[PDB]
Design an enzyme around this catalytic site. Structure first.
Site, PDB file in Angstrom:
ATOM      1  CB  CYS A 108      -1.040   0.241   1.056  1.00  0.00           C
ATOM      2  SG  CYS A 108      -2.501   1.655   1.521  1.00  0.00           S
ATOM      3  CD1 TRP A 280      -7.055   9.446  -1.644  1.00  0.00           C
ATOM      4  CD2 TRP A 280      -7.696   9.310   0.209  1.00  0.00           C
ATOM      5  NE1 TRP A 280      -6.072   9.861  -0.798  1.00  0.00           N
ATOM      6  CE2 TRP A 280      -6.675   9.892   0.170  1.00  0.00           C
ATOM      7  CE3 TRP A 280      -8.647   9.620   0.810  1.00  0.00           C
ATOM      8  CZ2 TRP A 280      -5.648  10.632   1.279  1.00  0.00           C
ATOM      9  CZ3 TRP A 280      -8.454  10.171   2.565  1.00  0.00           C
ATOM     10  CH2 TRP A 280      -6.894  10.538   2.849  1.00  0.00           C
TER      11      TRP A 280
HETATM   12  C1  HEM Z   1      -6.885   7.046   1.672  1.00  0.00           C
HETATM   13  C2  HEM Z   1      -6.122   6.920   0.991  1.00  0.00           C
HETATM   14  C3  HEM Z   1      -5.408   5.352  -0.142  1.00  0.00           C
HETATM   15  C4  HEM Z   1      -4.555   5.371  -1.228  1.00  0.00           C
HETATM   16  C5  HEM Z   1      -4.210   6.475  -2.098  1.00  0.00           C
HETATM   17  C6  HEM Z   1      -4.077   3.659  -1.435  1.00  0.00           C
HETATM   18  C7  HEM Z   1      -3.689   3.303  -2.410  1.00  0.00           C
HETATM   19  C8  HEM Z   1      -3.294   2.175  -2.464  1.00  0.00           C
HETATM   20  C9  HEM Z   1      -2.919   1.894  -4.330  1.00  0.00           C
HETATM   21  C10 HEM Z   1      -2.678   2.521  -5.498  1.00  0.00           C
HETATM   22  C11 HEM Z   1      -2.497   0.071  -3.990  1.00  0.00           C
HETATM   23  C12 HEM Z   1      -2.509  -1.060  -5.106  1.00  0.00           C
HETATM   24  C13 HEM Z   1      -3.908  -1.000  -5.721  1.00  0.00           C
HETATM   25  C14 HEM Z   1      -3.405  -1.533  -7.256  1.00  0.00           C
HETATM   26  O1  HEM Z   1      -3.505  -0.941  -7.989  1.00  0.00           O
HETATM   27  O2  HEM Z   1      -3.556  -2.784  -7.428  1.00  0.00           O
HETATM   28  C15 HEM Z   1      -3.050   0.021  -2.272  1.00  0.00           C
HETATM   29  C16 HEM Z   1      -2.786  -1.025  -2.028  1.00  0.00           C
HETATM   30  C17 HEM Z   1      -3.743  -1.610  -0.742  1.00  0.00           C
HETATM   31  N1  HEM Z   1      -4.363  -0.720  -0.036  1.00  0.00           N
HETATM   32 FE1  HEM Z   1      -3.822   1.475   0.212  1.00  0.00          FE
HETATM   33  N2  HEM Z   1      -4.916   3.352  -0.591  1.00  0.00           N
HETATM   34  C18 HEM Z   1      -5.417   4.424  -0.098  1.00  0.00           C
HETATM   35  C19 HEM Z   1      -5.706   3.631   2.187  1.00  0.00           C
HETATM   36  C20 HEM Z   1      -6.017   2.389   1.615  1.00  0.00           C
HETATM   37  C21 HEM Z   1      -6.811   2.312   2.848  1.00  0.00           C
HETATM   38  C22 HEM Z   1      -8.054   2.885   4.357  1.00  0.00           C
HETATM   39  C23 HEM Z   1      -6.186   0.813   3.956  1.00  0.00           C
HETATM   40  C24 HEM Z   1      -7.649  -0.253   4.615  1.00  0.00           C
HETATM   41  C25 HEM Z   1      -7.640  -0.357   5.355  1.00  0.00           C
HETATM   42  C26 HEM Z   1      -6.075   0.126   2.264  1.00  0.00           C
HETATM   43  C27 HEM Z   1      -5.544  -0.811   2.226  1.00  0.00           C
HETATM   44  C28 HEM Z   1      -4.754  -1.203   1.311  1.00  0.00           C
HETATM   45  C29 HEM Z   1      -4.119  -3.009   0.708  1.00  0.00           C
HETATM   46  C30 HEM Z   1      -4.662  -4.102   1.631  1.00  0.00           C
HETATM   47  C31 HEM Z   1      -3.499  -3.438  -0.285  1.00  0.00           C
HETATM   48  C32 HEM Z   1      -2.183  -4.185  -0.929  1.00  0.00           C
HETATM   49  C33 HEM Z   1      -4.051  -4.888  -2.442  1.00  0.00           C
HETATM   50  C34 HEM Z   1      -3.073  -5.958  -2.119  1.00  0.00           C
HETATM   51  O3  HEM Z   1      -2.586  -6.720  -1.401  1.00  0.00           O
HETATM   52  O4  HEM Z   1      -4.014  -6.437  -3.309  1.00  0.00           O
HETATM   53  N3  HEM Z   1      -5.583   1.270   1.339  1.00  0.00           N
HETATM   54  N4  HEM Z   1      -3.451   0.669  -2.330  1.00  0.00           N
HETATM   55  C1  XEB Z   2      -4.811  -9.779  -6.462  1.00  0.00           C
HETATM   56  N1  XEB Z   2      -4.990  -9.112  -6.749  1.00  0.00           N
HETATM   57  C2  XEB Z   2      -4.568  -8.199  -6.611  1.00  0.00           C
HETATM   58  C3  XEB Z   2      -5.914  -6.791  -6.036  1.00  0.00           C
HETATM   59  C4  XEB Z   2      -6.176  -6.295  -5.368  1.00  0.00           C
HETATM   60  C5  XEB Z   2      -6.995  -4.532  -5.534  1.00  0.00           C
HETATM   61  O1  XEB Z   2      -6.889  -4.596  -4.524  1.00  0.00           O
HETATM   62  C6  XEB Z   2      -6.220  -2.880  -4.968  1.00  0.00           C
HETATM   63  C7  XEB Z   2      -6.595  -2.561  -3.685  1.00  0.00           C
HETATM   64  C8  XEB Z   2      -6.614  -2.558  -2.181  1.00  0.00           C
HETATM   65  C9  XEB Z   2      -7.196  -1.308  -1.334  1.00  0.00           C
HETATM   66  C10 XEB Z   2      -6.864  -0.071  -1.637  1.00  0.00           C
HETATM   67  C11 XEB Z   2      -7.128   1.303  -1.194  1.00  0.00           C
HETATM   68  C12 XEB Z   2      -6.987   2.893  -1.461  1.00  0.00           C
HETATM   69  C13 XEB Z   2      -6.728   2.293  -2.740  1.00  0.00           C
HETATM   70  N2  XEB Z   2      -7.077   3.972  -3.372  1.00  0.00           N
HETATM   71  N3  XEB Z   2      -7.154   1.759  -3.715  1.00  0.00           N
HETATM   72  C14 XEB Z   2      -7.046   0.412  -3.553  1.00  0.00           C
HETATM   73  C15 XEB Z   2      -6.531  -0.978  -4.428  1.00  0.00           C
HETATM   74  C16 XEB Z   2      -7.373  -4.730  -6.572  1.00  0.00           C
HETATM   75  C17 XEB Z   2      -7.940  -5.524  -7.725  1.00  0.00           C
HETATM   76  C18 XEB Z   2      -6.413  -6.739  -7.613  1.00  0.00           C
HETATM   77 CL1  XEB Z   2      -6.107  -8.010  -9.078  1.00  0.00          CL
END
Ligand code: HEM
Ligand code: XEB
Ligand code: HEM
Ligand code: XEB
Ligand code: H4B
Ligand code: H4B
Ligand code: ZN
Lengths: 411, 407
Positions: A108, A280
Site C-alpha cells: 500500500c 481515495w
Molecule cells: C486513503 C488513501 C489510499 C490510497 C491513495 C491507497 C493506494 C493504494 C494503491 C494504489 C494500492 C495498489 C492498488 C493497485 O493498483 O492494485 C493499494 C494497496 C492496498 N491498500 Fe491502499 N490506499 C489508500 C488507503 C487504504 C486503506 C484505508 C486501506 C485499508 C484500511 C488500504 C489497504 C490496502 C491494502 C490491504 C492493499 C494491498 C492490495 C493487495 O494486497 O491486493 N489502503 N493502496
Molecule cells: C490479486 N489481485 C490483487 C488486487 C487487489 C486489489 O485491491 C487493490 C486496492 C486495495 C485497497 C485500496 C485502497 C485505496 C485505494 N485508492 N486503492 C486500493 C486498491 C484490486 C485488484 C486486484 Cl487484481
C-alpha cells in the site's frame, strides 16, 4: 540481525530491525524469489499464542505492558478460548487491529494515512439486510460529498467457517461487464463473471457501459442476497480533458469511492471474512489500469486515434502519449468536481516520507516494490530508486478465495 | 516444487522446472523478500568444473559419451596439477552465450545465442588490452548496424594478477564537479572522471567528453588510452516535431558496452570481459536524461514545452518524459543506428520466455529490472509473473577496482 536499505538517488540508508517480528512466510526461499508472484477452520491449539502476541502488541502501544490490565485481559481471553473456542475483541482492540492491518499492508502506497481510519463496528450484524444498512452508512460517510474519508466496516468474525459473513463484490462500487455473443465485452471486462452471477441471482441489468453493480451480501453463511445501492449515495465523475474538447465525447465516467470488500482481516488469530474498507483513488488506478490495461476498458486505441497519433509503429510511443493524456484527464476531472484524488508523484513522495518516518519510529516499514512503484513513469517517482524490504506482520489484510468457489448453497 | 507462473493479461500459465537446477543463492528467505535490493580452491573448483562440463556435453548431445568422460578426466587432472584449468574455445563460447542467457535482469536475452565471442586470453598488457577493445568496438558498432559481442581477457589466477577494465562502460561521458556547486556532464561518472584526471587525463571539461580507457593487465597499475574518435559512433538528438529540441545540445553514444562485470564459467573467473549489445530507448531517455542523479534535463525540456509546472498533477514530468523518449528513438532510427523501443523489446522478451519454458523448462527473470522505467503496465512483462533464481555460468558484480587495487 540488522538490515540496511539504500535509496540510490539520495544515498539515504535506513536500518530495519522490525523484520525480526515477522511471523508469516513470503513465498521466497534462499534459492528462489517469488516477489513478483501475485498470490503466494482454525483451532484453539494455535489461537492463544496469536491472541497473546496480538495483546502484547496492543498493550505496548498504549504503554501498559505487564500491567494488571494487560495480565487480566490475557487471563480473560485465555479462559474464553478454552471455554468457547474463540474470543471477542474489545472495541479499542478492534480499532487498533484494523489500523495496524492497514499499516502493515506492504503493497500500500497510501499508508501515510493509516492512523486516520474511521472504524465501524458491525459485529452486531446478523442479516444480509443488516449488511446493506451498514454498507450504505459506510458509503455515505466515506464519500462525504466528495471530500473522502478513510473508513472500514467490520462484520462478525469467522467461527467454524460454516457461518461466514462475506461481501461477494470485489469493491462496494463497481461497473458491470457483459460478454457479447460476437466476443466483444460491454462495460468492464474485469467484472464479467460477477455480473453473470448477479444477473443469475435475479438482477435486472440495464446493460450499459457504466452500470453500478448491486451489492451481493451473505450473512452467517446463508445464501447471498441482492441490494441496489441508492444512486444518490453513488458519487461519480464524468471524465473530461482540459485541452481536448472531444474527450468528453468518449462518454467516460468513474466512481469516486474505491472501497475494497473481498479481503480478509486477521487480528489476534481472529478472522474477519467481511471487512469492506475505503480510501481515495490515486489517478493511475483509474487512468492507467482501469482504462488502459488491455483486459479492461482499453481506450488507448480510440484516444490515440482522436489525437491523430502515428499508430503505425510502436516506436512513435503513441501508446505512451495517449496514456499520459488519459491520466491528465482523470486527475483534472476529479479536481474540477472537488472529489478527493492524489496523483502518482504526490503519493509516492508522501510514501517515501512515511517510510522514512516508520524506520525511525518503528524499526522498519515492510513494502512490496513491485506494487508500490506506479504503473506509469516509474523511474521519475522517488520510490523507484528506493530499496525496500518485504515481509508480513499481523494484524494483516489477506486474500481469500471468491465465495462463489467455496460457498455451500442452501436454497 | 514444480512452479507455475501466470500472465494476468492473457491467462497463460508456464510451468517452471529449471529452477531446481539453481546453484547460487537469492538474498531472500521465507521471512523476508529482498527482490528490490540492488546488490545482495582445488576442492571448490572441481565440482564447479564438473557441473559446467556436464551441462556442456548434455547441450551437444554427448552426455555420458567417451568424449565427455575423457574431458572430465583431463580437466580433473589439470586442476590437481595446476590448481586451475583452461576452457576449450568451444566451452568458452558456450559459457559466454549462457551467462547472457542466464542474466535474469536482461530484457534482451532473446538474442542470447547470436553472440560474437572474442578470445583475448593471450593478452598480456594494457596496450594489448586497448587493441582488443578497439577491435571489439569496431566490430560491434559496424557502422551503426550493431552486433552483440564480448571480449574475454585472461581469467583470474591468484587475485594478484587480475585483468580489469576500470570504466563501467567502454564508452561514457565525463562528469566534473563545478565550483558553482552543481555538475557538468554525467554526474554518475564524477569520481571516475576524477580518477582519470587524477591519473593524468587532460579533461576538455565539456558536457559530452568521451572518457578515456583505464586498462589494467596482470594486476599492474592501470593505463590510460583514448578510443579513436572515429570508432565512437554518436547520435545527435532531435525531436521529430519540436525544432527547438536540437538547441538543448543533446547527443548520446550508440554502443552500450558494459565493462565492470565478472564472468564466471565452470568455476573460473573472468574479471575483465567487456560486452555490448544495443540500447533499449528508455535506457538513455528515461534513465540517462531524466534521473535526478544524472543529466536531469526534465525541468528544462518541460519549460520549452511551456507546460504547467506549478503542480505535480498536471503530469508535466510525464508529458516531457514521453517526448524525450520519442526523440531518442527518432534520432537513432534516422541515423540508422540500431535501437529498440520498450514495447518491442518487452514483447520479444515474453516470446523468449515462452521459448525458454518450452525448450529449456524455464527462464530466470527479475521483474524489478525487466519492466521498463516508464509506461510499465502497458507493456506485456508487467502482468507477467516471473521467478528469480541464479544459474551458472553467470555475470556477477565485482567491486570497483580502485577500492581493491594494490598500487
Ligand atoms: C486513503 C488513501 C489510499 C490510497 C491513495 C491507497 C493506494 C493504494 C494503491 C494504489 C494500492 C495498489 C492498488 C493497485 O493498483 O492494485 C493499494 C494497496 C492496498 N491498500 Fe491502499 N490506499 C489508500 C488507503 C487504504 C486503506 C484505508 C486501506 C485499508 C484500511 C488500504 C489497504 C490496502 C491494502 C490491504 C492493499 C494491498 C492490495 C493487495 O494486497 O491486493 N489502503 N493502496
Ligand atoms: C490479486 N489481485 C490483487 C488486487 C487487489 C486489489 O485491491 C487493490 C486496492 C486495495 C485497497 C485500496 C485502497 C485505496 C485505494 N485508492 N486503492 C486500493 C486498491 C484490486 C485488484 C486486484 Cl487484481
Ligand atoms: C542486444 C540487445 C540488448 C538489450 C536490448 C539489452 C537490454 C537490457 C536492459 C534494458 C537492461 C537493464 C539495464 C539497466 O536498466 O541499467 C539489461 C541488463 C543486463 N544485460 Fe542485457 N541487453 C542486450 C544485450 C546484452 C548482452 C550482449 C549481454 C551480455 C553478453 C547482456 C547482459 C546483461 C546483464 C548481465 C544485465 C543486468 C546486469 C545486472 O545484473 O545489473 N545484455 N539489458
Ligand atoms: C542503472 N543501472 C545500474 C546497473 C547497471 C548495470 O548494467 C546495465 C546493463 C548491462 C548490459 C546491457 C546490455 C545492453 C543494453 N542495452 N543495456 C545494458 C545495461 C550493472 C550494474 C548496475 Cl548497479
Ligand atoms: C531500488 C531498486 O532496487 C533500483 O532502483 C532498481 C530498480 N529497477 C531497475 N531496473 C533497471 N532496469 N535498472 C536499474 O538500475 C534499476 N534500479
Ligand atoms: C505479475 C505482477 O506481480 C502483477 O502484474 C502485479 C504487478 N504490479 C502491480 N502493481 C499494482 N499496483 N497493482 C497490480 O495489480 C499489480 N500487478
Ligand atoms: Zn524474494
Amino acid at each position: 540481525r540488522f538490515l540496511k536499505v539504500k535509496n540510490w538517488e539520495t544515498d539515504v540508508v535506513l536500518t530495519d530491525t522490525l523484520h525480526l517480528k515477522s511471523t508469516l512466510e513470503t513465498g521466497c526461499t534462499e534459492h528462489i524469489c517469488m516477489g513478483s508472484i501475485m498470490l503466494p477452520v482454525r483451532t484453539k491449539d494455535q489461537l492463544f499464542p496469536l491472541a497473546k502476541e496480538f495483546l502484547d502488541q496492543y498493550y505496548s502501544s498504549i504503554k501498559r505492558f505487564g500491567s494488571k490490565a494487560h495480565m487480566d485481559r490475557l487471563e480473560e481471553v485465555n479462559k474464553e478460548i478454552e471455554s468457547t473456542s474463540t474470543y471477542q475483541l474489545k472495541d479499542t482492540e478492534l480499532i487498533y487491529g484494523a489500523k495496524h492491518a492497514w499499516r502493515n499492508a506492504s503493497r500500500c502506497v497510501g499508508r501515510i494515512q493509516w492512523s486516520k481510519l474511521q472504524v465501524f463496528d458491525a459485529r452486531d450484524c446478523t442479516t444480509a439486510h443488516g449488511m446493506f444498512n451498514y454498507i450504505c452508512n459506510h458509503v455515505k460517510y466515506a464519500t462525504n460529498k466528495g471530500n473522502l474519508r478513510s473508513a472500514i466496516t467490520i462484520f462478525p468474525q469467522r467461527t467454524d467457517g460454516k457461518h461466514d459473513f462475506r461481501v461477494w463484490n470485489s469493491q462496494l462500487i463497481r461497473y458491470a461487464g457483459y460478454k457479447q455473443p460476437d466476443g466483444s465485452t460491454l462495460g468492464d471486462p474485469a467484472n464479467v463473471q460477477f455480473t453473470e452471477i448477479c444477473i443469475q441471482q435475479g438482477w435486472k441489468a440495464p446493460r450499459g457501459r457504466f452500470d453500478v453493480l448491486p451489492l451481493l451480501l451473505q450473512a452467517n453463511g446463508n445464501d447471498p442476497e441482492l441490494f441496489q445501492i441508492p444512486p444518490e449515495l453513488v458519487l461519480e465523475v464524468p471524465i473530461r480533458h482540459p485541452k481536448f474538447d472531444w474527450f468528453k465525447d468518449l462518454g467516460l465516467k468513474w466512481y469516486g469511492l474505491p472501497a475494497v470488500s473481498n479481503m480478509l482481516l486477521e487480528i489476534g488469530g481472529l478472522e474477519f471474512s467481511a471487512c469492506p474498507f475505503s480510501g481515495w483513488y490515486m489517478g493511475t488506478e483509474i487512468g492507467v489500469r482501469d482504462y488502459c490495461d488491455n483486459s479492461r476498458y482499453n481506450i488507448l486505441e480510440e484516444v490515440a486515434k482522436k489525437m491523430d497519433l502515428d499508430m503505425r509503429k510502436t516506436s512513435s510511443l503513441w501508446k505512451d502519449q495517449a496514456l499520459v493524456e488519459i491520466n491528465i484527464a482523470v486527475l483534472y476531472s476529479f479536481q474540477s468536481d472537488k472529489v478527493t484524488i492524489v496523483d502518482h508523484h504526490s503519493a509516492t513522495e508522501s510514501f517515501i516520507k512515511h517510510m522514512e518516518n516508520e524506520y525511525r519510529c518503528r524499526g522498519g516499514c515492510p513494502a512490496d516494490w513491485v506494487w508500490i512503484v506506479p504503473p506509469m513513469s516509474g523511474s521519475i517517482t522517488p520510490v523507484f530508486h528506493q530499496e525496500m524490504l518485504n515481509y508480513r506482520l499481523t494484524p494483516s489484510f489477506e486474500y481469500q478465495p471468491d465465495p462463489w468457489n467455496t460457498h455451500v448453497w442452501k436454497g
